[PDB]
Amino acid sequence: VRYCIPGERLCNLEEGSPGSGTYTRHGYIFSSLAGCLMKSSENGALPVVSVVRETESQLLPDVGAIVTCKVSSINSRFAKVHILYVGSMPLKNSFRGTIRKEDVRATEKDKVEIYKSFRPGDIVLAKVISLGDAQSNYLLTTAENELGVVVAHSESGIQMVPISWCEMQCPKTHTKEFRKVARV
RNA sequence: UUUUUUUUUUUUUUUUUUUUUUUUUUCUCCUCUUUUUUUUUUUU
């Protein structure tokens, strides 16, 4: 196996096609990273050559991506969050987000009271939809059956458990509270 | 013995800032007269 530097001759446009993290010019394929030389043969020949470091310390979000978050504060019409994980991998820093009162459920419906959906301190799984404005920057959504709060936390510091699609209950004091439970 | 119709109060809010009293002119300028200078001493 061989590694890369962010420029070198790799292949012709006839001997393969550019993949992820690469660029081409003057009929040649040029590297743009310092990762590893991967040639996805796939099926149909002409492998899509690409270079991947495979050790992602940081990664910029996209138009569509799954992210693990952490609520900071909640408002009657939005809920500021902090992006913590990009899908699976840990993130070295923390970005910001905002869930408007249209992205909670998968119907973009009326009602949907924000107060009992995303209580602060929880950890949720959500998907971005846009690159946002300067007020709200990433505009995340949870309009799916698989998205919502996944690992909640009790009033007094006890791991919480899902109890229904909308209700969760404390194991110690048997107290009933409202969340937006995502499928496991 | 006089029917029917002619809408109404702009939409928006979740912006960063790492200095410090004052502050800046005015020129050279004839001093009049008994003196050397008296002086110990004691009573505070």
From Swiss-Prot:
Checking InterPro entries in the record gives:
Csl4, EXOSC1_C, Exosome_cplx_N_dom, NA-bd_OB-fold, S1_domain
Q: Which UniProt keywords apply?
A: Cytoplasm, Disease variant, Exosome, Neurodegeneration, Nucleus, Phosphoprotein, RNA-binding, rRNA processing
One GO cellular component assignment for this chain's record is: nucleoplasm
What compartments host this protein? Answer: Nucleus, Nucleolus; Nucleus; Cytoplasm
The Swiss-Prot or TrEMBL record annotates one GO molecular function as: RNA binding
Q: Which SMART domains match?
A: S1 (SM00316)
Q: GO biological process annotations for this chain's record?
A: RNA catabolic process; RNA processing; rRNA processing
Report the residue ranges that make up the S1 motif domain in this protein.
62-143
Q: Which residues carry this modification: Phosphoserine?
A: S17, S94
Pfam families attached to this UniProt entry: ECR1_N, EXOSC1
Q: What is its main location?
A: nucleus
Q: How does it assemble?
A: Component of the RNA exosome core complex (Exo-9), composed of EXOSC1, EXOSC2, EXOSC3, EXOSC4, EXOSC5, EXOSC6, EXOSC7, EXOSC8 and EXOSC9; within the complex interacts with EXOSC6. The catalytically inactive RNA exosome core complex (Exo-9) associates with the catalytic subunit EXOSC10/RRP6. Exo-9 may associate with DIS3 to form the nucleolar exosome complex, or DIS3L to form the cytoplasmic exosome complex. Exo-9 is formed by a hexameric base ring consisting of the heterodimers EXOSC4-EXOSC9, EXOSC5-EXOSC8 and EXOSC6-EXOSC7, and a cap ring consisting of EXOSC1, EXOSC2 and EXOSC3.
Clinical disorder: Pontocerebellar hypoplasia 1F: A form of pontocerebellar hypoplasia, a disorder characterized by structural defects of the pons and cerebellum, evident upon brain imaging. PCH1F is an autosomal recessive form characterized by hypotonia, global developmental delay, poor overall growth, and dysmorphic facial features. Brain imaging shows pontocerebellar hypoplasia, thin corpus callosum, cerebral atrophy, and delayed myelination.
Tell me which family the UniProt entry assigns to this protein. Answer: Belongs to the CSL4 family.
Its biological purpose is as follows: Non-catalytic component of the RNA exosome complex which has 3'->5' exoribonuclease activity and participates in a multitude of cellular RNA processing and degradation events. In the nucleus, the RNA exosome complex is involved in proper maturation of stable RNA species such as rRNA, snRNA and snoRNA, in the elimination of RNA processing by-products and non-coding 'pervasive' transcripts, such as antisense RNA species and promoter-upstream transcripts (PROMPTs), and of mRNAs with processing defects, thereby limiting or excluding their export to the cytoplasm.
The name of this protein is Exosome complex component CSL4
